[PDB]
Write a protein that binds this DNA or RNA. Sequence first.
RNA 1: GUGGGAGAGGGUGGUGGAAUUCCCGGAGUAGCGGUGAAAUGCGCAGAUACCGGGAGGAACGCCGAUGGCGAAGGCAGCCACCUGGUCCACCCGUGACGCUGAGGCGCGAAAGCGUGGGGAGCAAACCGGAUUAGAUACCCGGGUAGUCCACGCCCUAAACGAUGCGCGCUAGGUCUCUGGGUCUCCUGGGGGCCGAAGCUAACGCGUUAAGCGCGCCGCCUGGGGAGUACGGCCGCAAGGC
RNA 2: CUUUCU
Lengths: 73, 101, 119, 88
Amino acid sequence: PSRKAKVKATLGEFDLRDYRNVEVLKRFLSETGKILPRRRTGLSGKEQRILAKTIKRARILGLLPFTEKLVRK
Amino acid sequence: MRRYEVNIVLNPNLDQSQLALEKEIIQRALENYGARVEKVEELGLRRLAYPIAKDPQGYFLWYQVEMPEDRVNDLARELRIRDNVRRVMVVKSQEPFLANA
Amino acid sequence: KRQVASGRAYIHASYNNTIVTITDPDGNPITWSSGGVIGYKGSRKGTPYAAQLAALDAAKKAMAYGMQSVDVIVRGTGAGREQAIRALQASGLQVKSIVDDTPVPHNGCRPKKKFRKAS
Amino acid sequence: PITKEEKQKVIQEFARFPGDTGSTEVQVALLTLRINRLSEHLKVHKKDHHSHRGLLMMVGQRRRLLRYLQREDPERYRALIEKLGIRG
RNA sequence: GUGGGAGAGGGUGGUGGAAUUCCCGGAGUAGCGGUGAAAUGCGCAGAUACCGGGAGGAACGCCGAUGGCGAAGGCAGCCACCUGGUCCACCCGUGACGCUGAGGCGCGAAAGCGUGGGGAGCAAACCGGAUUAGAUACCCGGGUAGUCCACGCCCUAAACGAUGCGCGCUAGGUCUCUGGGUCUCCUGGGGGCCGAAGCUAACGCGUUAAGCGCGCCGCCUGGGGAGUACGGCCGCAAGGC
RNA sequence: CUUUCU
Ligand SMILES: [Mg+2]
Ligand SMILES: [Mg+2]
Ligand SMILES: [Mg+2]
Ligand SMILES: [Mg+2]
Ligand SMILES: [Mg+2]
Ligand SMILES: [Mg+2]
Ligand SMILES: [Mg+2]
Ligand SMILES: [Mg+2]
Ligand SMILES: [Mg+2]
Ligand SMILES: [Mg+2]
Ligand SMILES: [Mg+2]
Ligand SMILES: [Mg+2]
């Protein structure tokens, strides 16, 4: 299914343009520096589109990861 | 002129002196190029997602200036020159696109 | 003959043969086994059974340096990987944690023909 | 780019009367502006073909507007060209 | 014109991390690799698997789509500069200034060519292993041109929607991207699917027409010979028209 | 794996 809970839902109004709120951005990455799909980010074309750009600017600065190791398997 | 946001990440192992010295050359250069400082935020040390120059931490600077766009790129060649400056990123300022509001 | 007690267990699976390398708490390999190391020479080398025997021998050889606790790290998908992990889980060693760390490119080198036809 | 200042400065500069935003003159004026800036940009970036088409169209639009002007008021025409500094 | 908008549209410079290859160091042995099986091949001058450092080239995971942009070819890491197109609102200005477009000029995937540079991975040719009755192939191990950059040339294609461009007219339904609105829907632009009328040989098309009309362009006239011969024009050549 | 012709 994948209906655990939209990331957007569990959250307040934040500035999607802010490439430093590592606090919240941290929320749109999976158990890997991978940017969550819309059916998880619960965002929308436009938003989801600016999210991605933000997240990347961060990764570069060094605030967000590019990729994590999976802990299980 | 346009409003930009400069990002700087230096070596988190600089002593009171060296550290404030870098801010010297920086504050200097910013002006030397036409950067009119509209304000600053200095979070300082932060845990990097991944190591930047073996160093697993970083010292972050953040200034929002107003400068002649025709020189932005040079202003950053300059900033990158310093050895303790390990990350530079100039961004065009933008209205904060909210959501979940 | 060093007595390490705790360290890493790297498991390199592939459709062509598994190969386990046990290391110390910071990377330097203590011992290593594989489908080759044990009997099996060609096709069988890959097989999940082999993976088992390799995982064991890898550990047994490790019990020499007095190993006890290990952190497993799996790399790649292939003919018996979870097998190799079960073997270790038994053996003697205590499996503190397991981790999929297979390397993926963010798209760099054109894969040889045999691996193209995708996108 | 072309600042709003740079723009209106031209609109007023050519307008036929206070309020004239789109006379044949004002238009031919503004085009010549964009054209020259662009003609400039391409003196460099000779490989920016995609932008060149744009120019190719701005010109057409202009020479087409002038054709019309000549036909209607030949006076304003000679008047405009000489001014803007077109032809040659 | 004024005010807004989305965007892998184009050009220059900069820069980020993942991975491969190579080199250095550590630790560590007898294999690794590869297949349907194998072998060639690499490894005790110590390979594979593991860690740390370095050099270099090329591409840009997730987001990513059923998505967007462009006239087409095509265009996706991030940043700045330069720059093209397009859409909406207000209805403010000019007052038919419009459409099409033989020839012209320009653009034009890939391969290819010329000079110079670059060269990690991949890889025509080629050098080997295997399979086979044979294997000038498919599979395996290597590998040069090339793939990359620059400047110049080539101009082709299933260059496809196999559907020239513009305008008007003719039920709706549903999903979608972007703008406005009195924003559980209305309205404009764009992408999809199902369908009225109608059209079609049928398949299907159906306000994104292949329907009803008007304007302008290009093209067809049984198959093979043949996109060949001849002539001409273009190209360094290959070759193109 | 391959696996021609009638
Ligand atoms: Mg634009
Ligand atoms: Mg009016
Ligand atoms: Mg009037
Ligand atoms: Mg071409
Ligand atoms: Mg080419
Ligand atoms: Mg060449
Ligand atoms: Mg090869
Ligand atoms: Mg080959
Ligand atoms: Mg529509
Ligand atoms: Mg019907
Ligand atoms: Mg239909
Ligand atoms: Mg000739």
